[PDB]
Subunit: 315 residues, 4 copies
């Protein structure tokens, strides 16, 4: 009679130890309170720092997620993950998961052996959220610090705080307070069941690099991407994707070689607006790191700029 | 009879023209002169005797350190004069993260140095420029602005060069510091100071570019999943003196990054691990290469690192700098 | 071919003169509205929103409902002051019953100020209202290039242009470079799905807001009691926490049939249920929005459990 | 060798228990101290139990007691600083009281915790550690009264509970934090540009009862009678939690004026949660500057022990 939730562990600080790494079965054991929310099965997809998360491991994760959500005896899925790269992995699965069932990413800033470690509660909130049927159809979820954020908006905004994960402009989809879920907001983009993206039959994703925008920014960074035959480049623009004349050169250069370039921003938030005056596609409100994921996945369907641009406004 | 303020222009949307007023995105930055700017706010004659000066007429995307030196040498030139009470600097927003901070390190006077910008062209409806400029001259003329570090004014806020930054691509209230706030606000034609910068700045800064003609080259390299090593090889192949890593979370290096950083350190390039995050502390970790950016943005870390390398190549001296400025 | 939009004028700083105004002056001032829609102006009232009252709200609410029921009205823009934009839009959010966009707009600076925000806000509001894609999103609050939900957004700073924020909830959408980007949707009961109708209401119940604080006087409840208020909202310390003096005074009111909601003086967040304390609980609703919900709920029911649920659903 | 730090306990959720860890009985100061053995690496601790209450119930009387005692401790050469355990519900006020009230350079760090000590991932232990770390840094000196939760060091003058229930609640969007605590080092970033502690004129050393000040909220249809009830019960000051920038409706206008008739001092603050309420000649009452309703009661309250002069009280609000 209780929901059947699978915890796929991938590593991260939620799984570390010290005197201030640890497998899935322990994370579960450190919170016996999980018993009261779901029947839990644990599975170890990887044990790496999320900084070392790569498109390849994401292909395995995504495939295993869809494989499990296809099952009649799996109600939702909770994914244990680091925070340094939690910007990208949930957005990946938001684009790539074929189910309506809850996929929920959980993480912690303090390791399990820290004074007032956030992992235990984050995990509890994440399983509770996953075990809720009202949690379906919401897109991939990101749960830490009592907040349920959308994979499309939520990112790490502070380097070291427990409350890092924010989306200033779009808030949190909802909230977990006093052992109650409080949904307030619904993502208004294409995701999960409605997404045209399918990585089920993909062995390898196209390479996509990220170039920063800044005063005196080198044109030779683009030459690198161009040389190594990268498929896409995400410019992390000054302000609203603004390019200097080196950005301009580098980008236009890349574009003649058939490299799809998307101008995002280095600011943290907001719309990069369309502009005939500048080269490259526009990222809408997509962060540089999430733009990479969308571009990377977009480059498995098409190379067409207007089409991909279309994705960038809808996804 | 009243304070003598000088406005030094560098271009930017504050001085952008556009064909129509409904249009907010995609125009000509630095199309108009400091005199056109000043003329549109005749209210400034209530605050200051104003002299305008055109240092540059570029969009701040194209702001180069070469113009920064020139600008920094000029501010110091003026504030040393008896007839100059404070400077206002009109500037783009795209790169207003870095120019204020630069002069925060290189200005040598108590006097107010207030950068000012607009998110909307002068032609836009409800253009923020005039009010912003009014506030900028206000702050500058007020003796009580003295010794507060270099200041950034937009949207009735007075932020510190050290903390403030463009936090949104396109909104008027872009310039924020979640963790540090604003030194002061401007409300009902009054200045309210609330905060002071608890870092080293201006008069007490050890960095002096009065006689420097070429600042050392510093590249920023982003952190992300599947980040390539070859970007580090690129900076090395080009004789760069410092690299700022815009790291994942608190400057976390991937395998590729660790190796890339480490190649750079071999050939004597100083590496600072900053954060793509947007705020907060990158703490020392002796299990990771390069030094640590404290709470300085990749943009700002690039500036300090650059100016640091004019003084020393000592990794420990520079690490001290990040913790102090 | 171009959408029909009625701008309903209520007053506010968006319509103020200085030495450093009717709906038609406002319209005249943004000639670019003509590119967005065909515009009719109406002056519902001309007050500072600080002087906005339930009975003017009713007049407005019915008029809005009346306008939106026409074939030839596509949407409604309400010009209004900021000091009470917390309340007015939420009111309409529950009482309106078309999917047609109802867009409140305001300005922190008067039209005469350097870099006055009125014109641009008014432009945005109309653009939003004239967009087919705006339908059925609940009542909206446009200022400073954001589309806020009436359920969430509130004045968070006394005097800045960007005052209107909902930290926990962000914006519904945004207006950048002359285009609208919708991003999130109100996951609460609103407009067409709301049970709250005021068509047949002449006077709304009286509801007071009492502030929570160290040494808070119990007599404030005694006062609200003397004047036979129907409901009290408590702007509690923290998550709606009562002192002994608040505990007893609320319990006092509750025994006289007055319905008490416990909200927060904090600015955001959930006041969770608690059997150890009296009053109902305000979910994430502010004190000012709690008033609007409670006073409307009092037109329907006096039943604590039903009222309580409204606060979790609406 | 190590700094001597006194912990003064007043109660609060930091000292709060519950039946299960997934969700109240009181816990002593020494229970809080033994829960964190790592404190001994930071300082010598003395525990002192001043009160044991929810901060809902914190009164101006106990704050007087809390003040006199903190001044008495800090006056000693062998006391380097004091950490105060206090509920979150009324940390808006107590800290600011002490900020005007303490005569010492020496750190006064308030600490609290949003989740009970009993709760899974409870925030009490780490918060206090932080609070003691700050109180035992000699660099915490001369910064005014300090508030530590969620790794942040906030100024008493600015910081407030902005969310009902979350861990990161205590913010000040316009002013930020004075410092933060990250990876077991303190990082100072900002200084309070206001009169505080040693420069304050507010002396309650010989004050037994504080004047009464009510807070009356501003809203649509706001009743004039709140003001009358304030008046009837001999209140010496009223703080107005106004609409926008302390804006008064016809009723608050009449009501304030009435209270001004009786020599009740009124301050127009704001219900919004941040920002400047400007002077407006065409409106009654004094003006709060950027002070919240809660902190305004506190500043008004103390000003009325010193003076009843409208001009002088207004100066306090632009200075403190
Ligand atoms: N390096 C860690 C950081 C964290 O989880 O907080 C990670 O795996 O992402
Ligand atoms: N592209 C412009 C943006 C602005 O100033 O608002 C610049 O940086 O010059
Ligand atoms: N007093 C004005 C303030 C404003 O609109 O900004 C009002 O009507 O609310
Ligand atoms: N009721 C508690 C709330 C808390 O501390 O979290 C108090 O203020 O004492």
């Amino acid at each position: 009679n209780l929901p059947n939730i699978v915890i796929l562990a991938t590593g991260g600080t939620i799984a570390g130890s010290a005197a201030a790494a640890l497998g899935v079965e322990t994370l579960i054991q450190a919170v016996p309170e999980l018993k009261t929310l779901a029947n839990i099965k644990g599975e170890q997809v990887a044990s790496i720092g999320s900084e070392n998360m790569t498109s390849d491991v994401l292909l395995t994760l995504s495939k295993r997620v869809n494989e499990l959500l296809a099952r009649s005896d799996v109600d939702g899925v909770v994914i244990t993950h680091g925070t340094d790269t939690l910007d990208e992995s949930p957005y990946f699965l938001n684009l790539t998961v074929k189910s309506d069932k809850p996929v929920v990413f959980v993480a912690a800033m303090r390791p399990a052996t820290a004074i007032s470690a956030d992992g235990p509660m984050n995990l509890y909130g994440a399983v509770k959220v996953a075990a809720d049927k009202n949690s379906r159809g919401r897109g991939v979820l990101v749960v830490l610090n009592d907040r349920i954020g959308s994979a499309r908006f939520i990112s790490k905004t502070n380097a070291s705080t427990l409350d890092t994960f924010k989306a200033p402009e779009e808030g949190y989809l909802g909230v977990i307070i006093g052992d109650k879920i409080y949904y307030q907001t619904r993502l208004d983009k294409v995701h999960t069941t409605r997404s045209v993206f399918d990585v089920t039959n993909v062995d390898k994703l196209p390479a996509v690099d990220i170039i920063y925008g800044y005063q005196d920014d080198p044109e030779y960074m683009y030459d690198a991407s161009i040389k190594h035959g990268v498929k896409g480049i995400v410019y992390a623009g000054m302000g609203a994707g603004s390019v200097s004349k080196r950005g301009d050169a580098g980008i236009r250069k890349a574009e003649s070689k058939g490299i799809v370039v998307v101008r995002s921003s280095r600011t943290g938030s907001g719309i990069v607006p369309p502009d005939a005056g500048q080269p490259g596609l526009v990222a809408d409100s997509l962060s540089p790191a999430k733009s990479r994921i969308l571009l990377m996945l977009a480059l498995t369907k098409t190379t067409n700029p207007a089409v991909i641009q279309d994705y960038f406004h809808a996804y």
